[PDB]
């Protein structure tokens, strides 16, 4: 199977620098043309840069808005593509995908945020049902992630084990800081009998938090 | 630069029916007798996935029901029969020459029978209160259509400031939508008032679904 893994996104000041990199496997790398594509809410999907294979002299091409500032390169011996980004601006903010065989294959993306705002870790609060007990034959628990920057966080339930019946909602900006919540629904036998734990990771601040959902005591 | 313009912006199709999405180029994408037009599918929280190339040819391993047509400046993606899992944003994209450019995307929604939300209400957690904050949270899960209204009441009195609503993208399995509504207050203001209520007005019922608690229970 083909596999692409980006790394090196995060937060940076306007005017600063950042080097993304991409590890590929599953196809003959030195033959492949590789590109970087980015995605923002404002401009949609933008092709950023191309690097061609050995046969095409490792030729490079760039989008107009990044020429002079961004440089794409490859190490065919390590199967890696790099994207050096200098003199970054607020509009460079977005999700950066590494693509292989032009756009046949795509990585999961890495997030780049250009802002002079400071990294802030999230508070994570377990949301248990109302003091009183369970309405019915299923029960809904929750988990609130408040006050973080930049994006993203990743939230799971029982470290990924409990996946169906989950609704994790899009983050929103609450006066410079992001808030999101997630609900999970199980049958009333499952909880509280078996313990259910909200797991939140915020790579930007090296935060990993686990919050067990306890029923409320008066 | 070649500019790709998609239409419609979004579209709602029943299971088993045909969906047709268009893409118009500002100038011809033909080169070497091939129309350089590709289509991608982006599900929620995912990278784009490659579906069609050279206008009409299916990507390696891509299902039978996705097909494409066109040449020059006018192209289209056709999906038949439409399935639950096909809910996504579809992009056209042009590789005739540098710079490579994408369309604005077209949102496909799957039609299903109406369904009322399951509403759950959550007081501020002990941990949030001892930290000096207070957020009251309402989950409205698994409803259709996406159109819904939420109303907060504090002591029977309507409230608007501090409310934030976030919808999921349509579910790939059951074609429903879910939503969180979050009233955030100062701890000082939370502890003045006693009765917190969350009212969901939705197409499925004339009278709302009400869920409530009192701070002292």
């Amino acid at each position: 199977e083909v596999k692409l893994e980006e790394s090196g996104g995060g937060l940076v000041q306007p005017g600063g620098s950042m080097k993304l990199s991409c590890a590929a496997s599953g196809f003959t790398f030195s033959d492949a043309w590789m590109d970087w594509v980015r995605q923002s809410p404002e401009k949609g999907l933008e092709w950023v840069a191309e690097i061609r294979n050995k046969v095409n002299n490792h030729a490079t091409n760039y989008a107009e808005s990044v020429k002079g500032r961004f440089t794409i390169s490859r190490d065919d011996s390590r199967s890696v593509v790099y994207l050096q980004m200098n003199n970054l601006k607020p509009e460079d903010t977005g999700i950066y995908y590494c693509t292989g065989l032009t756009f046949d294959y795509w990585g999961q993306g890495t997030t780049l945020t250009v802002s002079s705002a400071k990294t802030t870790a999230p508070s994570v609060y377990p949301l248990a049902p109302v003091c009183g007990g369970t309405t019915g034959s299923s029960v809904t628990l929750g988990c609130l992630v408040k006050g973080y920057f930049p994006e993203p966080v990743t939230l799971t339930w029982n470290s990924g084990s409990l996946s169906s019946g989950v609704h994790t909602f899009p983050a929103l900006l609450l006066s410079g800081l992001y808030t999101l919540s997630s609900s999970v629904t199980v049958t009333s036998n499952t909880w509280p009998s078996q313990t259910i734990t909200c797991n939140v990771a915020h790579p930007a601040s090296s935060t990993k938090v686990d919050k067990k959902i306890e029923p409320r005591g008066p | 630069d070649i500019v790709l313009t998609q239409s419609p912006a979004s579209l709602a199709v029943s299971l088993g029916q045909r969906a047709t999405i268009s893409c118009r180029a500002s100038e011809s994408v033909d080169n070497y007798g091939i129309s350089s037009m590709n289509w991608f599918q982006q599900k929620a929280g995912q990278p784009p996935k490659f579906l069609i190339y050279a206008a009409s040819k299916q990507g390696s391993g891509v299902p039978a029901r996705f097909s494409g047509s066109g040449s020059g400046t006018d192209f289209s993606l056709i999906i038949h029969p439409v399935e639950e899992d096909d809910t996504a944003v579809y992009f056209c994209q042009q590789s005739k020459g540098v710079p490579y450019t994408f369309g604005g995307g077209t949102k496909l929604e799957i039609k299903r029978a109406d369904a009322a939300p399951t509403v759950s209400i959550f007081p501020p957690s002990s941990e949030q209160l001892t930290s000096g904050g207070a957020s009251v949270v309402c989950f409205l899960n698994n409803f259709y259509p996406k159109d819904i209204n939420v109303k907060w009441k504090i002591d029977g009195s309507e409230r608007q400031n501090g409310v934030l609503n976030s919808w999921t993208d349509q579910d790939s399995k059951d074609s429903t939508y879910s939503m969180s509504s979050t009233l955030t207050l100062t701890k000082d203001e939370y502890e003045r008032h006693n009765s917190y209520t969350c009212e969901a007005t939705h197409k499925t019922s004339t009278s709302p679904i009400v869920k409530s608690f009192n701070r002292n229970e």
């Binding site: 033959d31 492949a32 043309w33 294979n53 046969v55 065989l101 | 350089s36 490659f50 050279a54 590789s95």
Partner: peptide, 12 residues
Amino acid sequence: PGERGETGPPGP
């Protein structure tokens, strides 16, 4: 096609 990709630019 194993180099340029099926989505890559047309070429002679």
